[PDB]
Every structure is written in C-alpha cells, then in structure tokens.
Amino acid sequence: MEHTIAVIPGSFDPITYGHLDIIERSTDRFDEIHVCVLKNSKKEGTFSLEERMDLIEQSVKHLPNVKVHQFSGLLVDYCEQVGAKTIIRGLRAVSDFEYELRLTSMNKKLNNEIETLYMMSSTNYSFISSSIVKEVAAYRADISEFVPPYVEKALKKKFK
Amino acid sequence: MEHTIAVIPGSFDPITYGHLDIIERSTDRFDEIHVCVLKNSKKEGTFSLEERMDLIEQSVKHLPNVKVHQFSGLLVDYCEQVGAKTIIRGLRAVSDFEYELRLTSMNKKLNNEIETLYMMSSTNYSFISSSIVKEVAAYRADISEFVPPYVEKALKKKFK
Amino acid sequence: MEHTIAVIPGSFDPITYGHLDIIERSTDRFDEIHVCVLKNSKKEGTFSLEERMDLIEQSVKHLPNVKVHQFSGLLVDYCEQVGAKTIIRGLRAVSDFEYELRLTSMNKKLNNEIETLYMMSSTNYSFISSSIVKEVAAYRADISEFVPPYVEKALKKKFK
Amino acid sequence: EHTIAVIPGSFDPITYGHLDIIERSTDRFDEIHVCVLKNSKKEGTFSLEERMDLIEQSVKHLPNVKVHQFSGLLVDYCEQVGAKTIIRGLRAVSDFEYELRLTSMNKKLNNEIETLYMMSSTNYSFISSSIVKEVAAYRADISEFVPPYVEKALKKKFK
Amino acid sequence: EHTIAVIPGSFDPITYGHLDIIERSTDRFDEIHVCVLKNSKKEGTFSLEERMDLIEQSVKHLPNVKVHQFSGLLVDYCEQVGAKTIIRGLRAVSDFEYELRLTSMNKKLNNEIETLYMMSSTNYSFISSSIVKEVAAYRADISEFVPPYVEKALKKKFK
Amino acid sequence: MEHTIAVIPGSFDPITYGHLDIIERSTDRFDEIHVCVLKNSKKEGTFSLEERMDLIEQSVKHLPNVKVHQFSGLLVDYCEQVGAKTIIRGLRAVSDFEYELRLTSMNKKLNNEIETLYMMSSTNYSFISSSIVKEVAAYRADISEFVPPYVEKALKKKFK
Ligand SMILES: CCc1cc(Sc2ncc(C(=O)O)[nH]2)nc([C@H]2CCCC[C@@H]2C(=O)NCc2ccc(Cl)c(Cl)c2)n1
Ligand SMILES: CCc1cc(Sc2ncc(C(=O)O)[nH]2)nc([C@H]2CCCC[C@@H]2C(=O)NCc2ccc(Cl)c(Cl)c2)n1
Ligand SMILES: CCc1cc(Sc2ncc(C(=O)O)[nH]2)nc([C@H]2CCCC[C@@H]2C(=O)NCc2ccc(Cl)c(Cl)c2)n1
Ligand SMILES: CCc1cc(Sc2ncc(C(=O)O)[nH]2)nc([C@H]2CCCC[C@@H]2C(=O)NCc2ccc(Cl)c(Cl)c2)n1
Ligand SMILES: CCc1cc(Sc2ncc(C(=O)O)[nH]2)nc([C@H]2CCCC[C@@H]2C(=O)NCc2ccc(Cl)c(Cl)c2)n1
Ligand SMILES: CCc1cc(Sc2ncc(C(=O)O)[nH]2)nc([C@H]2CCCC[C@@H]2C(=O)NCc2ccc(Cl)c(Cl)c2)n1
Ligand SMILES: Nc1ncnc2c1ncn2[C@@H]1O[C@H](COP(=O)(O)OP(=O)(O)OP(O)(O)=S)[C@@H](O)[C@H]1O
Ligand SMILES: Nc1ncnc2c1ncn2[C@@H]1O[C@H](COP(=O)(O)OP(=O)(O)OP(O)(O)=S)[C@@H](O)[C@H]1O
Ligand SMILES: Nc1ncnc2c1ncn2[C@@H]1O[C@H](COP(=O)(O)OP(=O)(O)OP(O)(O)=S)[C@@H](O)[C@H]1O
Ligand SMILES: Nc1ncnc2c1ncn2[C@@H]1O[C@H](COP(=O)(O)OP(=O)(O)OP(O)(O)=S)[C@@H](O)[C@H]1O
Ligand SMILES: Nc1ncnc2c1ncn2[C@@H]1O[C@H](COP(=O)(O)OP(=O)(O)OP(O)(O)=S)[C@@H](O)[C@H]1O
Ligand SMILES: Nc1ncnc2c1ncn2[C@@H]1O[C@H](COP(=O)(O)OP(=O)(O)OP(O)(O)=S)[C@@H](O)[C@H]1O
C-alpha cells in the first residue's frame, strides 16, 4: 500500500461496546485509526466534549493504533489534511442505511477522493445506541453489558 | 502493514458500470483485488461462466491489481485458500441492505476471520443492475451509458 | 391543456379494484387514458394476453375515455408513438416504492420527456394484489369485494 | 385447552429460528398447533410427510405442541379447532411488509382471528430454511442452525 | 388474573388506533393494563392526569382493562404484577424498526417478558396522536379519529 | 380539458434545485402552479417567511405559470378556495414515502376531492435537502451545484 489511515467519526455520548466492536474490527485493517468527534456541534449531549474524549481515551487504551481527535470543519477536510482515504461507519438498521446514504452522497460531492466504508453491527450489539443506554442508566439498571467499565462509572455518577 | 487481498463476489451477468465503479473504488485501498465468480451455480443465466470471466477481464485490464477468478464451494473458503480477510459488496437500496445483512451474518458464523465491508453505489449507477440492463438490451435501446464497451458489444450480439 | 394522454401499464393478471381505483382517479385528468400491457412477455401468469385485455375492457366499460392496448417494445416508445407524456403508477407499500424508483430512473435515461406520476393506493385497497386475489380464489372464498363482477366470473371458472 | 394458538409455515425444514418462536409461545396458550399446508405445490426440498416428521421430532420436548396439516384456508383451520390466534415471527422489514398484506386479507376472511407477531431473537434473525440449505449443499456444518435430527435429514439429502 | 398483558404508551391523547389494539386484546388475556409513564419529559400536550382520565373513560366499557401510572422500567412493572406479555401496535415500517430496538433491549432487561405485536387495522393505519392534534388546531372534524370524550378535550384545548 | 391548478406545498428553507426540478417537471402538466408556504408555522427555520417567499419568486420567474403564495389554515382548505384539485410532492427515499403516505391518508379524509400526486427525485438531486445544504453552507463550502444563484448568495451572506 502506502501508509494507511481511517477515520471513525461519531458523537460517542457515551461510547458503547457497539462503537467499540467497530473500532476493534478496524484495528488490524489499518495502520492508524483516528476516532474523531465534533467541536461546537451546537447540539448538547448528556456529556461534554472533554468527558466524551476522555471516555473514549480510557475505553480504547488496550488498542495501541487508535488515536482520538476533534475537529472543527468538514470531516472530509480532516481526512484530506491528515492522510486518510477511508471513513468507517457502522450500520445497525435500515434507518442507519438511509441516513448514511444521503451523507456519503454529499461527502462524495465535497471530496471525491474519500471513500466511506460500512460495517454491519454484529448481532449482539445492533440494538445498542447511546440514547437507549443513557435511558436505561436513568433508571439505574445494570448497564455493564452495554458500555465499558469507565463509561459505566461515568453514567452511575451522572444519574444519581 | 501486511499484505491485503479483498474478494469482490458476484454473478456479473454481465458486469456493468455499477459493478466497475465498486471495483475501481477499492483498488487503491487493498493491495490485491480478487473478482470472484461462482463456478457452476445451478442458477444458470444469460452468459456462460467463461463469457462472464472474459467480459470482466476485458473491462478490468486498465487496473493492474485486479485479478478475475472462478470457484465452486463456499465463498469464505475461497478467501481462506487465497488469504483474503475482506469481502466487498455494493449497496444500491434498502432491499440490498437487508439481503446483505442476512448473508454477512451467516458468513460470519461460517468463518469469523473474514470481514465484509460495503460501499454505497454512486448516485449515477444506483439504479443499474444486470437484470434491468438485459431487458433494455432486448429491446435494443442504447446501453453505452450502463455497461463498458466490451460488454456492450456482447449484449447487442446476444440480443441481435 | 393540450390533447393529453396518460399511459397506465401493468400485467393486470387479473385487473382488480386496486387497479381500477387508480384508473378512475386518473380519467378526469387527461383527455384519454391508455391501459397498456406488454405483448410477448415470456413471463406467463395465469390468464393469456387475450383474456387479460378482455377483462380490462369489460371492467372499464363505464368510463368513456379509457382504452386498452398492447405493445410490442419499450413503454417509453409506446408513449412516444401515441403522443403521451405521462405514465401513471400506483404505490401500496415500500416494496412498491423501491421497485418503482429503479424503473423510473431507467425510464428517465431512456426518454427524459416522459414523466411518471405516482398515486397512493386508497386505504381499503392497499393490501390488494392480483396474486393474493388468485390465492383466495383457489379456495373459492368470496372475492366480490376485490375484483369487479366480470373478473370474478373469470376467476371462479379458472379455479374449478 | 381453553386457549389455542396456530403457528403456520412451510418449515422446509424447520430451524432453530422457527423453534425459538414456538418455544416462546408454549407457555402463553394451553395448546400450540404447528400447521403445514397440504397440497401446496412447488416442493421440494422435502415432502409434506418428511416435513411433518421433522417438526414433530424437533418439538417432542414441548408437551403442549401438536403438528397438523390442512388443505384449506388457515382461518378455517382455526375456527375448526377453536383457535383465536395465529402466531408469526418477524426478522426484518421485508417480513413485516409481507405479513402486513397477509393479515389484512386474513381479516376480511375472518374478523375474529388475530395474528400476533414476535420478533426473532437477535441470534436467529439471519436464519431461513433457504440459507441453511445453501450451506448444507456445500457440506458445511449446520448444527448451530437446526436441531440434530434435522441436521441428519439435510446431510442425507445433500450427501 | 392468571394472565396479564401490559399495553404501554404516551396516549397524548388516546385515539381510535390505540383503542382498537386494546379492544383486540381483551378477549385474549384475563387482564389488560394500559400503562403510562410517571415523570416523563417533552410534553404537552395533555398532562399525566388529563391523559389518564381520557384513557379511563375511553375504555370503561371493557371490564378487564385498568389504567395505571408507573415511574420505573416497563419491564419492572410487568414482573411485579405478574404480566409476562407486553402488547404493542405496528402501523408502518418506521414503527417496526423502532420497536425492534426496544424489544431487543427489554429482552436484555428481563428475559421472561415477551413483546407481542398487532398490525393496525387498515382503517386506522395513518392515525397518530400527533396528527390528530395537528387537525384539531385548525378546527377540523376529528370524530372519525378519537372517541367522543377525547373529542371534547381536543375541541377545548385548541378552540 | 377544464382549467387545472396544482399546489406544491413546502417549507422551502431554502428552495434547492431538488425542489425546483419538481416544480419544473410540473409546469407543462397543469395550467397554474401555486407554490404555497405555511404562514405562521411555529417551528421557525433559518429564513423568515418573507425571505423564503422572495427566494422562490426569483427562482421561478422564467416559468410564467408559477406563482408563490402563503396560507394560514389547512392545505386542503387552500386548495378548495382557489379550485386546485391536485397537490404535488416529491420523494427521494423510503422515509419520504412513509411520511407522505400518512399525510395523504389524512388529507383524503379532510377532503376527498383533492388528489396528491408524487414524483421521484431525479438521481442527481436524490440526496439534496435544505437541511444538508445549510450545514454544508455553514462550513463555507461551494453549494452552487445544489441551489440556484440567488439562493447561493443569501446563504453566503447568512453564514459569512
Ligand atoms: C459520513 C460521515 C459524516 C458524518 C456527519 S455527521 C452529521 N450529519 C448531519 C449533521 C449536521 O446536520 O450537523 N452532522 N456529517 C458528515 C458531513 C455530511 C455532509 C455535510 C458535512 C458533514 C460534516 O463533515 N460535518 C462535520 C463533521 C466533523 C467531524 C465529525 Cl467527527 C463529523 Cl461526524 C462531522 N459526514
Ligand atoms: C456476500 C457474498 C456472498 C454471496 C452469496 S450469493 C448467494 N446467496 C444465496 C444464494 C443462493 O441460494 O443461490 N446465492 N452467497 C454468499 C454465502 C452466503 C451464506 C451461505 C453461503 C453463500 C456462498 O458462499 N455461496 C457460494 C458462493 C461461492 C462463490 C461466490 Cl463468488 C458466491 Cl457469490 C457464492 N456470500
Ligand atoms: C414503470 C412502468 C414500467 C413498467 C415495467 S414492468 C416490467 N416488466 C419487466 C420489468 C423488469 O425486468 O424490470 N419491469 N417496465 C418498465 C421499463 C423499465 C425500464 C426497463 C424497460 C421496461 C419496459 O419498458 N418494459 C417494457 C414494458 C413493460 C410494461 C408494459 Cl405495459 C409495456 Cl407496453 C412495456 N416500465
Ligand atoms: C398468516 C399466515 C398465512 C400464511 C400464508 S402462506 C406463507 N407465508 C410465508 C410462507 C413461506 O415462507 O413459505 N408461506 N398464507 C396465508 C393466507 C394469506 C391470505 C390468503 C389466504 C392464505 C391462506 O390461508 N393460505 C392457506 C394456508 C397457508 C399456510 C398454512 Cl400452514 C395453511 Cl394450513 C394454509 N396466511
Ligand atoms: C416496548 C415498550 C417500551 C416503550 C418505551 S417508550 C420510550 N420512552 C423513551 C424511549 C426511548 O428513549 O427510546 N422509549 N420504552 C421502553 C423501554 C425500552 C428499553 C429501555 C427502557 C424503556 C422503558 O422501559 N421505559 C420506561 C417506560 C415505562 C412505562 C411506560 Cl408505559 C413507558 Cl411508555 C416507558 N419500552
Ligand atoms: C402533503 C401536503 C401536506 C404537508 C403538510 S406539512 C406537516 N405535516 C405535519 C406537520 C406538523 O405536525 O407540524 N406539518 N401537512 C399537510 C396536512 C396533513 C394533514 C394534517 C394537516 C396538514 C396541513 O394541511 N397543514 C397546514 C399546511 C398549510 C400550508 C402548507 Cl404549504 C402546508 Cl405544507 C401545511 N399536508
Ligand atoms: N451498536 C452499534 N453497532 C454498530 N455501529 C454503531 C452502533 N452504535 C452506533 N453505531 C454507529 O457508530 C457511528 C457513530 O455513532 P453515533 O454518532 O455515536 O450514534 P448517534 O446517532 O449520534 O447517536 P446513537 O449512538 O445512534 S444514540 C454511526 O455510524 C452509528 O450508526
Ligand atoms: N449499480 C451498482 N452499484 C453498486 N453496487 C452494485 C451495483 N450493481 C450491483 N452491485 C452489487 O455488486 C454485488 C454483486 O452484484 P451481482 O450479484 O453480480 O448482481 P445480482 O444481484 O446477482 O443481479 P443484479 O441484476 O446486478 S441485482 C452485489 O452486492 C450487488 O448489490
Ligand atoms: N391495490 C392497488 N392499489 C394501488 N395500486 C396498485 C394496486 N395493485 C397494483 N397496483 C399498481 O398498478 C401497477 C400495476 O401492477 P401490476 O403489474 O398489474 O401487478 P403486479 O404488481 O405485477 O402483480 P401484483 O400481484 O398486482 S403485486 C403497479 O404500479 C402496481 O403497484
Ligand atoms: N429465524 C426466524 N426467526 C423468527 N421467525 C422466523 C424465522 N424464520 C422464519 N420465521 C417465521 O416463520 C414463519 C413461517 O416460516 P416460513 O414460511 O417456513 O418462512 P420461510 O419460507 O421458511 O423463509 P424461507 O428460507 O424463504 S423458505 C414466518 O412468519 C417466518 O417469518
Ligand atoms: N393507529 C394505530 N394503530 C395501531 N397502533 C397504534 C396506532 N397509533 C399508535 N399506535 C401504537 O401505540 C403505541 C403507544 O402509543 P404512543 O407511544 O403514543 O405512540 P407514539 O408514536 O409514541 O405517539 P404517536 O406516534 O403521536 S401515536 C405505539 O407503540 C404505536 O405503535
Ligand atoms: N431533492 C429533492 N428532490 C425532489 N423532491 C424533493 C427534494 N427535496 C425535497 N423534496 C420534496 O418537496 C417537499 C419538501 O419541501 P421541504 O421538505 O419543506 O424542504 P427539504 O428539501 O425536504 O429539506 P428538509 O424539508 O429540511 S428534509 C417534499 O415533498 C419533499 O420530499
């Protein structure tokens, strides 16, 4: 090849094993995995950018090649700047498919050199979303099956 | 990082620009690309195995890293025999999404070392299929927009 | 307006109240409606081309400006030949939507002066198809709510 | 036997997908009838009698599940037997749209039968008879998808 | 009270679509609990109290239906009261995908609760609370869509 | 035929080439086209009613038969006042289809004299929404391919 980077964009509010299975399935497929998050999203999520970045950073410790960045402008500009010709997105459902088809179509208009590549969520994590883990957290049920140790502790302390 | 082979499977009956677009977009992302055809399916169609393979070769000759192969037996065993750790499939529409989700779930049960990735069809080929191209060729309308020139000449011939 | 014609294609095997609904809602919007069927289908359903046209002919007798025709080749060519600028189709479900999208994108590349307009099935006929009416008829249940009196007689005869 | 549920299907052959639906049903009704259409046509792979034999053995261990065949309309088998309820499984959007059409028709055929749907378990969602059989045709392992006695019938048939 | 079924929702307000699901269940279990969530958020249009009142009146002809509020997990409610079945309606593809995600979670949350679905009847497939309110804000006729008691409550609220 | 009016309702926040293509494909099939906007929609967007109205008027001025209006009240009550028997909408994907099915089922109960007709998005406009054109405009990327020039000017101003 050459030297190979893939970007894995997301909100990760918070990161879950669903998101991790995708990053983990990407690690020995590329040289460098950049987990990437949006700055001044203007939405507002349960957790701040910083906490979100640290929750990722602690969850992805056991994988050397994964970095965690933030940005700024267009994601396709990031891939341009930094040497990645490949974006990785997961699919859980028809819903995801539709939303991603319109984004990829726009991105391919913005930068024809970048490709987006999809992976199907695996079976035991396809119903996982952070929205719904956050909901279960609010009722203080056991989330240990859904998110890693660190973000588990960050949601207990958030919902009490 | 290590050598990468991707397998791009299909019946290619015949190959279309839609198929070509997916092969082209993957060439700079893997070291080797195997285009795989199903040796002796019991599901016979317009062109012979051998006609189909030649049409691929002629349409893929401007791409040095693309080889065209035939196999009977399970697809995940072909990948295993040639060391390919990745299958590549295109997605046109929701119906594709669903059928693909089902096949990838079984292929993963068959051999969990092989990962399937997807690319979305380009907006301009999203409606192309072998099926709809053959129908159009049977009323000998013009198909130069839909298949490469070798395939075009073979369609006018077939439906003369 | 001009002298306007609209073409309403299909298999009609047999025509149902579902089809007739679409036809009736169209008849006051164009000077002339053409119900068109493909000749030499090499698809064979249950009723021959001749039977199918007679059924259509008897079911639309009460609308002066509807005509029944057969063709030959490409739908957009019939439209070109007869001076029609509009194809009309019905939509029952997402399944219909996705299929019809693929077909009109192609018809657009074949002749961009023909437009296709869609109508939603009315609520009471959304679940009707020729296929499921045929199955009901095999068990000789009452289909009078699904097909018009003449198609009904043709169906009772066909299935005993 | 105050309540009865019918679980109709081709079952060509039955799989752990079908069987999970049946298992999740047994404790909610007094009696479960698994029904298969007699004098269908277009079969292949297994005959009616083979298909019935395969099901009755895979459900042996569920004391309230009986296997029957019928050649008329489902909704009539139901009124024949006293069942107020049909049970079907959903794996995907395509099943959902298919079943929406069947049940709208079924409701014009007989307004007192209800059809209740259960989502396929996450582990079995990808399973169909069609694809178990592709896999068996390449002599690959299928114990994770069908019960042992169905597995054996499949090896015999695909050598 | 051998068998209980829980029918959960916002019911903001209840409509004939919801009632048709509720009515289609009553003959199938001994006891139906329409439940609603205490301490919600995003609402509007009617308060918890007004909502439970409208339900109560709308189902008073159904001896075995009770309306309850609850503050925890739907799946907690069920175990506590002995309900092993939850019932939900499907109008459309979008409902199917959303509900797949919920059931998959609830099944992790508790494994002895089934969710069973029923298809909307064809006459009520396009009815939602959302769109009924829309049409009542413009003073159109909603009597085809909601029961007479909820009609009056809509008329008042929107003039 | 008699004199025909079609209404094409929308937020148009802003109008895009996607909307316009629809409008243009309708001009030849009806006598008058009223492009209509809701007057005090209480979920405000990026342009006011006044701006949106100006932006349309400029964009459709070559199409003499197209007129811009605003209404307070039901869409079908507007159609009744002006004598329009037809409403026209465009569909880009599955989610448009389902949403539109439910709206039209209701509109048919409110007034069964009005027909809603549907047209598929042309392929190159399939991924365009106002939404995604604004997000791209906020990051100051070229949007001239997505909207006509008058509209391109205003969001250069709005996101400067
Ligand atoms: C497929 C990856 C992706 C995902 C998304 S996400 C989204 N969809 C809708 C909204 C929106 O309306 O804000 N955002 N957005 C995009 C682009 C879509 C087209 C417009 C520009 C978007 C873009 O590049 N935005 C900045 C960004 C920066 C860093 C990260 Cl990590 C991300 Cl995800 C996005 N491509
Ligand atoms: C995503 C690639 C793919 C595509 C398909 S295609 C298809 N799935 C069902 C039917 C059928 O029933 O006829 N056909 N089939 C498969 C496998 C799916 C799981 C069962 C085994 C399938 C398998 O490996 N089959 C042989 C084969 C060999 C070499 C080639 Cl190149 C191909 Cl494509 C297939 N994976
Ligand atoms: C939406 C109207 C329509 C419906 C269909 S229906 C169908 N038949 C087979 C397929 C297929 O293989 O997709 N689709 N086929 C078509 C065309 C799709 C583009 C390829 C050419 C098709 C075409 O023009 N085919 C001849 C024809 C069909 C119907 C009638 Cl009435 C006539 Cl006169 C001629 N457009
Ligand atoms: C909801 C179960 C069901 C299923 C089906 S058919 C199917 N759906 C998926 C597959 C499949 O995957 O093979 N087949 N067909 C029907 C009816 C549809 C309306 C027309 C009458 C049909 C009717 O009553 N037909 C006789 C029948 C069918 C099945 C059995 Cl068991 C019996 Cl005894 C009688 N309702
Ligand atoms: C299928 C019934 C249902 C419906 C919903 S509804 C909804 N609320 C927010 C969202 C969401 O963020 O998705 N979904 N939420 C749920 C649960 C899904 C699993 C996570 C926990 C949810 C849970 O148990 N919530 C409490 C509740 C209690 C009693 C009533 Cl009556 C209701 Cl409606 C909800 N299951
Ligand atoms: C497809 C045309 C259309 C589009 C929409 S849009 C929408 N549906 C839900 C929401 C909502 O909940 O806010 N909005 N709403 C409608 C009607 C659907 C039935 C209820 C009443 C809606 C109606 O007539 N509304 C006023 C209106 C006036 C003038 C214009 Cl131009 C429009 Cl678009 C709408 N039909
Ligand atoms: N359980 C999962 N399995 C596979 N992919 C996932 C999973 N959850 C999320 N993803 C994908 O990971 C990418 C980034 O996810 P997010 O942006 O964090 O999800 P989101 O839509 O912003 O909020 P959620 O996770 O759906 S509530 C998207 O492509 C998601 O579809
Ligand atoms: N126009 C296209 N754009 C992107 N991918 C495509 C396109 N056409 C086909 N593919 C994908 O290429 C892979 C192999 O396609 P084929 O198997 O050869 O097509 P097929 O499904 O057998 O018959 P058709 O008529 O092409 S759908 C599948 O994942 C297809 O969905
Ligand atoms: N019940 C219905 N309501 C509205 N449109 C319909 C209905 N049935 C069929 N149509 C449409 O009429 C056109 C002709 O369909 P056909 O070709 O006759 O039937 P078909 O779809 O090939 O076979 P079936 O059994 O009707 S699915 C297509 O747009 C159909 O989707
Ligand atoms: N894996 C599964 N999980 C849950 N339900 C299922 C599963 N497989 C089948 N079903 C349901 O079982 C009922 C009857 O199944 P079948 O009629 O035998 O469907 P099918 O024809 O076996 O699928 P094939 O491979 O096309 S034959 C239908 O409502 C199915 O959707
Ligand atoms: N017309 C209908 N027919 C059958 N079921 C319905 C109908 N309308 C709503 N439902 C079901 O009612 C259940 C709970 O009621 P709701 O939670 O209020 O639905 P909702 O989507 O949350 O609110 P809506 O969309 O404005 S009705 C949902 O899961 C729906 O599937
Ligand atoms: N690109 C397009 N091509 C064809 N029709 C479209 C397109 N975009 C929107 N429409 C349709 O025209 C009407 C939409 O007007 P609007 O929805 O109010 O604006 P918009 O482009 O959908 O961006 P949104 O509404 O924020 S998603 C609906 O019928 C849309 O489906």
Explain what you see.
The structure is a homohexamer. Chain A has one domain (1-160): HUPs (Rossmann fold, 3-Layer(aba) Sandwich), CATH 3.40.50.620. The first copy, chain A, is built from six helices and five strands. Chain A has helices at residues 17-26, 49-59, 75-82, 94-110, 130-138, 149-156; strands spanning 5-10, 32-38, 66-71, 84-91, 115-120. Chains in contact: A-B, A-D, A-E, A-F, B-C, B-D, B-F, C-D, C-E, C-F, D-E, E-F. At the A-B interface, strand 4, helix 4 and strand 5 of A face helix 4 and strand 5 of B. One copy of the ligand CCc1cc(Sc2ncc(C(=O)O)[nH]2)nc([C@H]2CCCC[C@@H]2C(=O)NCc2ccc(Cl)c(Cl)c2)n1 sits between chains C (9, 36-38, 71, 74-75, 78, 87, 89, 103, 106-107) and B (131-132, 135-136).
Brief rundown of the structure:
The structure is a homohexamer. By secondary structure, chain A is an alpha/beta fold.
Please give the CATH architecture of chain A: 3-Layer(aba) Sandwich
The greatest interface here is: A-B, 26 and 26 residues
Structural class of chain A: alpha/beta
Under the CATH scheme, which class of chain A? Alpha Beta
**Given the C-alpha coordinates, what overall shape of chain A results?**
globular
Largest sheet of chain A: 5 strands, parallel
The string of secondary-structure elements of chain A, in order, is: EHEHEHEHEHH
Per CATH, the superfamily of chain A is HUPs
What portion of residues of chain A belong to β-strands? 15-25%
Helix amount of chain A, in percent? 25-40%
Rg of chain A, Å, rounded: 16 Å
What small molecules accompany the polymer chains?
ligand 2VJ, phosphothiophosphoric acid-adenylate ester
Number of strand segments of chain A: 5
Strand order in space, largest sheet of chain A: 3-2-1-4-5
Query: In terms of quaternary structure, what is this?
Result: homohexamer
Tally of individual helices of chain A: 6
How many domains of chain A, as an integer? Answer: 1
Q: Would you tell me which CATH topology of chain A applies?
A: Rossmann fold
Q: Cα distance, first to last residue of chain A?
A: 50 Å
PDB class: transferase/transferase inhibitor
Keywords: phosphopanthetheine adenylyltransferase, phosphopanthetheine, Transferase-Transferase Inhibitor complex
Assembly: hexameric
Entry title: Inhibitors of 4-Phosphopanthetheine Adenylyltransferase (PPAT)
